[PDB]
Amino acid sequence: DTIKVGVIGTMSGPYALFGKNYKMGIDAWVAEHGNKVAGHTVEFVYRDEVSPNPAQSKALAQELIVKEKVQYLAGLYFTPNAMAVAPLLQEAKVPMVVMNAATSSITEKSPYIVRTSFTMFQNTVPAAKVAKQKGATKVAIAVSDYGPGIDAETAFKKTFEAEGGKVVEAVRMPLSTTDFGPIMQRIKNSGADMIFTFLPAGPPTLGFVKAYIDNGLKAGGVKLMSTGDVVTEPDLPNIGEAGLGILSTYHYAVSHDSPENKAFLALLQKGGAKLDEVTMTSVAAYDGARLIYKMIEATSGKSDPDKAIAAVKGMKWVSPRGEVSIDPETRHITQNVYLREVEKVDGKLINRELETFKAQPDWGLAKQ
Numbered sequence: 253d254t255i256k257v258g259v260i261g262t263m264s265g266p267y268a269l270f271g272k273n274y275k276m277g278i279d280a281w282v283a284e285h286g287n288k289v290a291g292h293t294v295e296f297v298y299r300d301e302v303s304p305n306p307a308q309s310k311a312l313a314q315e316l317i318v319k320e321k322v323q324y325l326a327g328l329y330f331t332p333n334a335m336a337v338a339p340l341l342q343e344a345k346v347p348m349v350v351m352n353a354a355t356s357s358i359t360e361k362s363p364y365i366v367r368t369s370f371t372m373f374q375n376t377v378p379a380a381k382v383a384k385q386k387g388a389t390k391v392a393i394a395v396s397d398y399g400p401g402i403d404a405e406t407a408f409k410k411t412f413e414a415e416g417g418k419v420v421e422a423v424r425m426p427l428s429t430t431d432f433g434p435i436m437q438r439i440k441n442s443g444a445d446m447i448f449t450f451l452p453a454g455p456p457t458l459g460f461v462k463a464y465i466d467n468g469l470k471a472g473g474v475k476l477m478s479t480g481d482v483v484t485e486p487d488l489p490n491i492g493e494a495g496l497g498i499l500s501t502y503h504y505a506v507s508h509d510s511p512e513n514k515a516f517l518a519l520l521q522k523g524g525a526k527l528d529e530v531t532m533t534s535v536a537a538y539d540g541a542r543l544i545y546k547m548i549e550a551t552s553g554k555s556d557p558d559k560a561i562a563a564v565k566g567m568k569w570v571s572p573r574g575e576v577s578i579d580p581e582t583r584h585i586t587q588n589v590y591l592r593e594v595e596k597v598d599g600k601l602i603n604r605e606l607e608t609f610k611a612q613p614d615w616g617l618a619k620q
């Protein structure tokens with residue numbers, strides 16, 4: 253009668269907050285909705301992804317399938333880890349609800365993947381539109397050198413150049429980069445008036461932003477446009493008031509002003525989470541738990557991945573982030589993308605949402 257769900261996330265190490273947020277978001281879901289579905293108890297089992305390490309995530313998934321007999325897998329912070337698990341799913345008859353990894357093609361790697369996070373194209377196409385609206389003419393792109401960074405670079409170049417913008421520099425930064433000073437010097441030298449950047453949220457984003465400020469680019473009038481990965485709320489106090497004014501596009505802000513988001517923050521606090529630790533992976537986990545409960549109801553708690561996936565395709569609901577749906581073609585969450593600016597409101601640094609771009613699909617797949 254117990255159905256287990258195996259959640260793989262960054263539970264320890266440099267990215268620990270992001271995996272802790274999967275547990276926070278699932279705990280919030282359970283605080284509201286309970287742990288019973290279709291006459292079964294649902295139990296979430298957590299395993300630690302740690303870092304980009306495909307073989308490790310493959311092995312964790314296989315252990316969860318064999319030893320824990322999970323009916324569903326979920327989580328996956330890093331793209332390469334999600335890619336390692338994807339080819340297992342159909343033979344194992346276990347769906348995977350991706351709660352972060354954001355490279356567009358992940359959903360194409362199995363019929364049994366559904367994604368409740370975001371894609372890089374989805375958030376980057378609005379960033380390029382806003383860059384043009386804000387008067388940028390020459391942009392330097394700097395992205396981490398792996399799947400989602402390459403998607404962000406491609407999306408920004410294509411969209412910005414179609415708007416008449418020029419990309420004057422494009423740097424793919426190794427994931428291991430910790431000293432960002434030389435990159436900042438290269439950007440200065442390029443004469444770009446704006447930077448567009450993505451790095452995975454965690455130490456790389458903190459380092460990049462601090463170098464952008466401390467090397468004087470921000471005060472020198474080189475504006476920063478990022479995806480929201482680069483300015484996650486728990487790092488705003490670590491950047492401090494020097495981060496005021498940084499622009500980003502993203503599908504979720506802790507400051508989102510809606511009744512559903514206010515209720516979600518209350519549930520996070522009631523499930524045991526702290527507000528200044530809340531990140532985007534919590535909302536992807538909360539919505540991913542909704543989809544898992546729907547799949548269990550649709551299948552009466554029996555393993556039947558074809559019926560489970562069919563039940564979530566086309567589903568529409570109001571998330572804490574805004575109105576969302578699962579596109580049946582891509583199995584990716586269609587959602588608003590917001591333009592935000594780092595602001596201080598009632599003594600707190602937040603990403604204030606200034607503009608909405610409604611109902612964005614995964615632009616990386618939508619024109620195929």
Ligand code: NA
Pocket residue numbers: 359360581582583617
């Ligand atoms: Na597809």
